[PDB]
Amino acid sequence: ETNAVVITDLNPLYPRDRDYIYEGAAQIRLIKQTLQNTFPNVTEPVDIDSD
Amino acid sequence: ETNAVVITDLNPLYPRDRDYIYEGAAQIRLIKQTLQNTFPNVTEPVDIDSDTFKIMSEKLKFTGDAMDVGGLMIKNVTPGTGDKDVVTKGQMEAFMKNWMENKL
Amino acid sequence: ETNAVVITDLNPLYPRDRDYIYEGAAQIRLIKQTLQNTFPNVTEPVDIDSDTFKIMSEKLKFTGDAMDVGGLMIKNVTPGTGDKDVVTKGQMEAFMKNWMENKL
Amino acid sequence: ETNAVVITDLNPLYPRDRDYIYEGAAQIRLIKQTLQNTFPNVTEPVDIDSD
Amino acid sequence: ETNAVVITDLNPLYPRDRDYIYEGAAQIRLIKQTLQNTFPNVTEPVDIDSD
Amino acid sequence: SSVTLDIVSASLDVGEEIVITATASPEGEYSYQWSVDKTGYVSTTSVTGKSIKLVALRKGEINVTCTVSQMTQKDYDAFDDYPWYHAVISNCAVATTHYETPQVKEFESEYFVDLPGWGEQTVVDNDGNPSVKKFNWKCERVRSFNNRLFALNMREANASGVTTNYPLRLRWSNFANENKAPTLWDDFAYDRVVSSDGQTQALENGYAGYIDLADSNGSLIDILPLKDYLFVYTEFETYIGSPTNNTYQPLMFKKLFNDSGILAPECVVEVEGSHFVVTQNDVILHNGATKKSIASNRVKNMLINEVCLVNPLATRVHLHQDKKEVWVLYVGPGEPKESFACTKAAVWNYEFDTWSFRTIPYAQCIGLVDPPVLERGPIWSDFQEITWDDPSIKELVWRKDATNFRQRVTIVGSFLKGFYQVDVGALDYFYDRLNDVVIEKPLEMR
Amino acid sequence: GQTQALENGYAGYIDLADSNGSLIDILPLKDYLFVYTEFETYIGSPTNNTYQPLMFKKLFNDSGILAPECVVEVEGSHFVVTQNDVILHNGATKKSIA
Amino acid sequence: YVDEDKDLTPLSFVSMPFDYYSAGNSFLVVGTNKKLYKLTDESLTDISRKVATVTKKASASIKIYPVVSQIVPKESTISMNFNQTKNLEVSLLPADANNT
């Protein structure tokens, strides 16, 4: 498993082309949980105005 | 899970149950919709300025716009926001031209 | 599935259904690197303060810097910029103790 | 072995004409290490001027 | 190890490996070059003045 | 190649901030480090980073320097005569070979790295101001006891780096933490607070120390704990280490034996509240303060000659707990004198105190591991036939791992370029040096 | 409005270090803890302190329970099938009934 | 475990079951004459300690001017009494004489 890790700060290439298939969905759950943790509020973020 | 349009209100825990093999691609596409919907304006996000974002996080009370705890000790020009030159501007108007004119 | 996208440009309408999807792991790497490149600073981003987003959304016209429409009813201490007592403080310094001594 | 000894301050005649051959190279390593320790910087020490 | 002309930047640890019997003489000659190059001005070093 | 810096002539005003970044001439996977000549005066955050903010603190001309490093692979030199000892602590794997730093693989890491705090020594620069002067430290064997890590046959270098070998030295580290190895090894660690530019001393009420025992010829061959008591062997005379649980230097070492001493660096195991030792003369099974000879007059005189014929130093032992057997590994009667592959094994069943012999497939090492051949699909694959075989009745977790892994099996590191199972169906694999081929023959029990 | 009114007993965690973990089973025996890992065992001795009183010491290097419900206290001892055979241990000593 | 391990001579190994990065399942910490390989029933991997054989450094003489530098500058000409047609110069120096 992946314990003691929080936030999407883990190094890339984690799948390493060799993880069977049972790690792909676990990666999605980690991404969803961390993304929720980063910004736990979204109503209408059209107020970017990159300029 | 098609229904999520407010975004960030997904259900990561359970309704997956490690099943069906084939919804992983659909979840990735759904995640792409959520990411694009939140920030559909990206040209060159080089304004990282981590210190700026991090400091305002501890503020957490900025509701009446800025409401900064400082004094905003910087400005360039205009009769709007006033620097220390307002006192200098006032005495010029009061003495040189308006109140205590030459030969007063 | 493309490859070199770092401008939050992930095409979700070009996959495939019967051929190889041996890129879902690679999609995760592609998604992760896009997120890291856009915001390479994430420790506790609670700094949204969603009410501020609604207030500045009412403005929505941020092109010439800030153009703040707040009140800025804060000031700590200084001998320079002053509140509505500018006229009083000026005639204290100019007349009361500077020019017109006692018994003027 | 030779432990707890630093710097080329050991008494002379250490080879004592009887050290097999495996101590000769060890002596060289000790000399090189101590010489490096004594002056760990050399650029162009032509500035002697013995006068 | 022929290459060392800046001196004091030798490699005492390893590239010896206790081998070949015959590079010991070459190392001694190389050490003589390093010592002479650093201080090629010696007539009577009586100015010890350790203090 | 040549590394440049963004700003080399910055002008701050006690409190002003500036971020200087390092730019190496080539581009690639490079690590970064930063340094400075004076303590403080700049608030360097995460010196291991590439772009460092520096907040001015005090007046003065400072010299800030960076350090860029080229991450490249370097081959080890662990020859056959000096194999790895592979200790375990706090779920981390330690390497511990000769001519190299002990090294550790952290639980939350995938690349080996030198032990944190290894080689550190807080030595005063001149009559005061104790500074952490890192010296070259190389070890022989490393084991664990009471959340600590230990060292044997310490070769301690220092300033004026002509190293001196200490066969009598024995050092221990601090206690570990959550998924982390012990952090420091300096004996003089204390008396240092607030070390910025930036060493850190935040321990777990456990310091590091050294005893430097006094015995015959030293060389400190092996160490093994037994019921919270240390047992160190010198091939002659033994000592018992009793921890007194103090703030600093808690370990107390007392003499146990005057003749006992292990033969090989891996010739002691804890079988049942006791140690199995072949003490250079015979087999001894001692429970502490008392010793008995399992090989008094049963297997003594025919073990001693067989081991001494080729290579006594290649001796090893292993505990075969699943069948309550303990065997000693040694080279066969006819073998090259420089060969370390154990060919014959003398097995002792401690459940009934009976001795036997068996043939092993040229064991370079032995250990207990989980069985292989777990059927799975490691690389994502579909080909063009069934479209991932859409599973009925949902799916079964893609694999069974809810049940804890079991059927743990002994494995052997073989000289025959591979891994071999030692306790399996009756078969044997002899080696033929005449044709440089491995031959398989039915196992012959006589 | 959280409340902290305890009974001079706090909460703690030890995070032991053993082989493959998974911490299959735990069972007390005469005020002494016995935890099993399917390999190697530890004894937990409470020292009766204000905070973090429990002290855990190693007992076995090969023993370890097979199933999450494979240990019972029969008579001042534990009945364990330790992945290899049946063991009846009274503490610091073990004997194999099988 | 895999076809690639058949060309290796394992000097030593550890049967560690737990790992942060991967689930585990015997990611044997095996050692060789030159490397520390690792096989976990799916493939062999090298996890040897990489070292910096080439190191390059750079310097930066960051001048740290004082925060109170152009504040209350030293002025020895407190009184500058002069004739009505005087053209005397005035001299002053900043505190610490740094930068600004």
PDB file of C-alpha atoms in Angstrom, chain D residues 1-7 30 33-34 37, chain F residues 156 158-167:
ATOM      1  CA  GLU D   1      47.306  -2.044  10.791  1.00  0.00           C
ATOM      2  CA  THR D   2      48.197   1.527  11.826  1.00  0.00           C
ATOM      3  CA  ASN D   3      45.328   3.159  13.726  1.00  0.00           C
ATOM      4  CA  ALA D   4      45.144   6.297  15.893  1.00  0.00           C
ATOM      5  CA  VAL D   5      48.090   7.859  14.006  1.00  0.00           C
ATOM      6  CA  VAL D   6      47.703  11.110  12.050  1.00  0.00           C
ATOM      7  CA  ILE D   7      50.188  13.499  10.387  1.00  0.00           C
ATOM      8  CA  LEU D  30      49.783   7.315   4.574  1.00  0.00           C
ATOM      9  CA  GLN D  33      47.046  11.344   2.889  1.00  0.00           C
ATOM     10  CA  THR D  34      49.105  13.220   5.489  1.00  0.00           C
ATOM     11  CA  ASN D  37      46.115  17.028   5.103  1.00  0.00           C
TER      12      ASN D  37
ATOM     13  CA  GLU F 156      37.742   5.506  11.965  1.00  0.00           C
ATOM     14  CA  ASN F 158      39.607  11.897  10.841  1.00  0.00           C
ATOM     15  CA  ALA F 159      41.416  15.108  10.005  1.00  0.00           C
ATOM     16  CA  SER F 160      44.926  14.343   8.797  1.00  0.00           C
ATOM     17  CA  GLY F 161      43.145  11.513   7.063  1.00  0.00           C
ATOM     18  CA  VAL F 162      45.645   8.719   7.617  1.00  0.00           C
ATOM     19  CA  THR F 163      43.044   6.270   8.892  1.00  0.00           C
ATOM     20  CA  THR F 164      43.618   3.930  11.839  1.00  0.00           C
ATOM     21  CA  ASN F 165      41.901   0.553  12.120  1.00  0.00           C
ATOM     22  CA  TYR F 166      40.117  -0.162  15.399  1.00  0.00           C
ATOM     23  CA  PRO F 167      39.341  -3.904  15.631  1.00  0.00           C
TER      24      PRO F 167
END
